[PDB]
Design a protein around this ligand. Structure first.
Ligand SMILES: N=c1c2ncn([C@@H]3O[C@H](COP(=O)(O)OP(=O)(O)OP(=O)(O)O)[C@@H](O)[C@H]3O)c2ncn1[C@@H]1O[C@H](COP(=O)(O)O)[C@@H](O)[C@H]1O
Ligand SMILES: N=c1c2ncn([C@@H]3O[C@H](COP(=O)(O)OP(=O)(O)OP(=O)(O)O)[C@@H](O)[C@H]3O)c2ncn1[C@@H]1O[C@H](COP(=O)(O)O)[C@@H](O)[C@H]1O
Ligand SMILES: [Mg+2]
Ligand SMILES: [Mg+2]
Lengths: 209, 209
């Protein structure tokens, strides 16, 4: 396949990327949410789409199994973005990386235990606050961890805050704002630039308005 | 909560554990699949259930946020089971850890790249075959990796083989048989044995037939 392969994740990133793609002359021919298929053609015969877990987008792009992709800044920070080029902030799937714990719970006077998927981000954030922390790596449902005493705080993405509030948790600290970024393979950028450039320019134009 | 906290995952493990629980006098009061809730009471007031990602069951059990749980041998091998007690093979959610690649694809003559969630299992298996391999850590959809050239083989769980066959892949090697196991926290076993013992005996009886 000589064309471009675009890596996306289902749900938020796919929903909010599709208008950008449509403006660029690229439309999916079916709904990937309703399929077991993983490779999808588009209305442009030079572009196909891989549907991945969000955590795997940078990996496929890094290794060149996709030429480019859309990934959340939270994922890029955690995975490490040293072997891809971040080209555009698409301003989509907006949220915050935050810390949170049980509402009005005092912090214990000892080395903190942080339950989180974002172990690198958690360590780096707490390092900036002067704390060397223990991390408990989890893969989902971070909001449960404080309720059953697994760790003293969590680090997770927060949008509306409804998940925190539903579970008797409150956000303690804002770490950083998060949005989805367009990343490119470092070799694809050099070899397939003529194919990438119109789509990059289209996206850039669309995000201005 | 002085009673027992049982860690389970949704889908396969929950479906096949429920009959074991029912025989032991423990029934959920609603369907966790249809809820955002994560802590669930049962018909026994001394037992509650946490609903977790499969990868997190050993972690909650290890740290004592759950007293016991049901986890697949594939997860236990990958996570490491040195800080829990494996008490019973429940013979449920049966499958195999296998290697697979594109059907009739020759292996390249160089260090192999293995795309997988099971990075420790992949390294240990290939070590037994005399190969020091590179691993590409993924979080899902392993069946895609060989189709887009991300790695030369995968390591994944296989049940019917339909996923492999649908994607033009075939299993190369059988690594080991996999089934779900009852794991217990090493302190809970010592302190809550009177509560655990009847349920352990019930499960053991049920799996004999
Ligand atoms: N609210 C978000 C959210 N908002 C924006 N995003 C971005 O969307 C990207 C892709 O979302 P995914 O669902 O693929 O990512 P994910 O849910 O973190 O991971 P998966 O377990 O679903 O694979 C993420 O990597 C983020 O950059 C969010 N990602 C996750 N959430 C979750 O939704 C819940 C919080 O929502 P509020 O209750 O509105 O705060 C929490 O569980 C959050 O973790
Ligand atoms: N077929 C199974 C399967 N059979 C049994 N099990 C066991 O069930 C346990 C719990 O299943 P989960 O769905 O929670 O685990 P998971 O799907 O590996 O992980 P999640 O991404 O869903 O969190 C696993 O840890 C295994 O021990 C299986 N776990 C996963 N699969 C998947 O189903 C597909 C293959 O099915 P066949 O096409 O029938 O081979 C592949 O994607 C497999 O990875
Ligand atoms: Mg999600
Ligand atoms: Mg599954």
């Amino acid at each position: 396949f000589l064309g471009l392969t675009l890596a996306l994740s289902k749900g938020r990133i796919l929903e909010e990327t599709m208008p950008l793609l449509r403006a660029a002359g690229v439309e999916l021919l079916e709904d990937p949410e309703a399929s077991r298929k993983l490779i999808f053609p588009t209305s442009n015969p030079n572009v196909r789409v891989l549907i991945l877990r969000a955590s795997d987008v940078p990996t496929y792009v890094e290794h060149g199994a996709a030429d480019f992709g859309v990934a959340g800044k939270d994922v890029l920070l955690e995975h490490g973005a040293n072997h891809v080029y971040e080209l555009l902030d698409l301003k989509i799937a907006q949220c915050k990386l935050m810390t949170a714990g049980v509402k009005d719970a005092p912090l214990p006077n000892r080395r903190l235990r942080i339950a989180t998927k974002y172990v690198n981000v958690a360590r780096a954030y707490f390092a900036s606050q002067g704390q060397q922390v223990d991390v408990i790596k989890l893969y989902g449902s971070m909001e449960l961890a404080p309720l059953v005493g697994l760790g003293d705080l969590i680090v997770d993405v927060v949008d509306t805050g409804n998940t925190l509030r539903a579970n008797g948790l409150e956000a303690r600290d804002h770490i950083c704002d998060v949005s989805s970024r367009l990343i490119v393979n470092q070799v694809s950028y050099k070899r397939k630039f003529a194919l990438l450039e119109p789509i990059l320019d289209s996206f850039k134009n669309s995000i201005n308005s």
